[PDB]
Amino acid sequence: QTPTGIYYEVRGDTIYMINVTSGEETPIHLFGVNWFGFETCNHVVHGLWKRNWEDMLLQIKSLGFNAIRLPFCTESVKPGTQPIGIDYSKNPDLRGLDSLQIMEKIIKKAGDLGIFVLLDYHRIGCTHIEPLWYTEDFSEEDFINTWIEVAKRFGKYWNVIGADLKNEPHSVTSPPAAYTDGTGATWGMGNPATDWNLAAERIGKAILKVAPHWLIFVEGTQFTNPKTDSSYKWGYNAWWGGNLMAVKDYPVNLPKNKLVYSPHVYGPDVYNQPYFGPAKGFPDNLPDIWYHHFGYVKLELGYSVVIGEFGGKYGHGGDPRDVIWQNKLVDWMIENKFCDFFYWSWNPDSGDTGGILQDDWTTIWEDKYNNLKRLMD
């Protein structure tokens, strides 16, 4: 049942933490941020050239966050990979540590602060998000075996809540070819080699054998199948990892008490969607768009839904409509009780969204944070 004494599960649309010995259950909310860099060729969370890693964790806590989503790549989690770009004067307790030891040190310190950790297998190799969970040189069996080794190691840390199986399943061609050409993720197409709903069951089963106390976070795809995507006027305009329209008729076949659906959703700083024009009803059109792409997964089907990534520059050197976008999304999350989320990103060095920190890696954007804070109370 659990190697830590703690077991995570979903009951209805809420995540619970259960102390198996005492029998005590506590509903938890995830007020999260992504801190990325383990999935990059730095092979370490970014910003350690400018900050001490613990001070960063303290600062994230001081802002009322209680969860971190931690992207990684395959080589970050194997012993022997060296981090690049750390200022060891600000980080002397990291001297002589490889990437894996640093990840263990960060997760343990997060747990001491009561911060939950979601592990996100974000890139197979450190360069770009592949559209599928395998490449020419790296098979589905390799991907699964990496998750197994990660679940065996990190399954021993009480605060690790589970596995976001693959970051942003997506397509690299347009429909109709995206459904059949073998180069991108589908859902409900029927082919188990490309259908993410089928692969997530295969990968998720393998994880739960070795970490039965974990949760399995499953993102959407970009396109699903032509019947689902055609059934809605903005069906071909969901984000990577953002299209959960096929959940209703093609649910992932995993235990309901272990499963969390985890859509990503973005604003006009990431892509100038047609629906962001006032001419197409922006912003009052947004609730029904979110509802269709993913929100019905919670509001109609009653699954647990955690927004795995959302964010934008909030008008600081980007499209000023992003302010309106992020306000409307937070208003909608509050109204509809999407209390669990991970903001993209803690890091300022994300080209099209910036983050909670400014470029100095020290000071936060107060207005963007003020808006977010409404979800935390």
Say whether 29 counts as a known binding-site residue. Answer: yes
Catalytic residue among 9, 168, 201, 219: 168
Listed in sequence order, the residues at least 6 apart from 343 whose beta carbon sits closer than 8 Å to its beta carbon are 32, 33, 34, 309, 310, 311, 356, 372
Q: Judge whether 140 is annotated as a binding position.
A: no
Measured N-to-C along each axis, helices 53-62 and 99-112 cross at an angle, to the nearest 10 degrees, of 30
Q: Are 239 and 307 in contact (CB under 8 A)?
A: no
Give me the domain span that covers residue 259: 1-377
Q: Which residues contact 244 (CB under 8 A, 6 or more apart)?
A: 220, 261, 263, 293, 294, 297
CA dist 54 and 106 (Å) reads: 8
288 is known to lie in a ligand binding site? yes
C-beta of residue 25 within 8 angstroms of C-beta of residue 10: no
> How far is it, in rounded angstroms, from Cα 300 to Cα 297?
6
Residue 274 sits in a domain whose CATH number is: 3.20.20.80
DSSP structure string for 275-292: GGSGGGTTTTTHHHHHII
Consult the annotation and say whether 352 binds a ligand.
no
Q: In 10 A of CB 95, how many CB atoms? A: 8
Active-site residue (options: 130, 201, 219, 309): 309
Cα 254 to Cα 3: distance, rounded to the nearest angstrom: 21
Does 120 carry a binding-site annotation?
A: no
Residues linked to residue 70 through DSSP beta bridges, in sequence order: 119
126 is in an annotated binding site: no
Residue 168 falls in the annotated catalytic set: yes
Look up 140 and say whether it is catalytic: no
Q: Which residues contact 22 (CB under 8 A, 6 or more apart)?
A: none
Taking residue 17's Cβ as centre, other Cβ atoms within 10 Å add up to 18
Complete edge-to-edge strand list for the sheet that includes strand 259-261: 259-261, 215-218, 160-164, 116-123, 67-73, 31-34, 341-343
Q: How far apart are CA 335 and CA 275, in angstroms?
A: 21
What number of CA atoms fall less than 13 Å from residue 114's CA on the CB side?
A: 10
142 annotated as ligand-binding: no
* Nearest of 115, 137, 226, 136 to residue 182 by alpha carbon: 136
Counted domains in the chain? 1
Burial of 41 from C-beta contacts in 10 A (0-12 / 13-18 / 19+): middle
List beta partners, residue 48. none
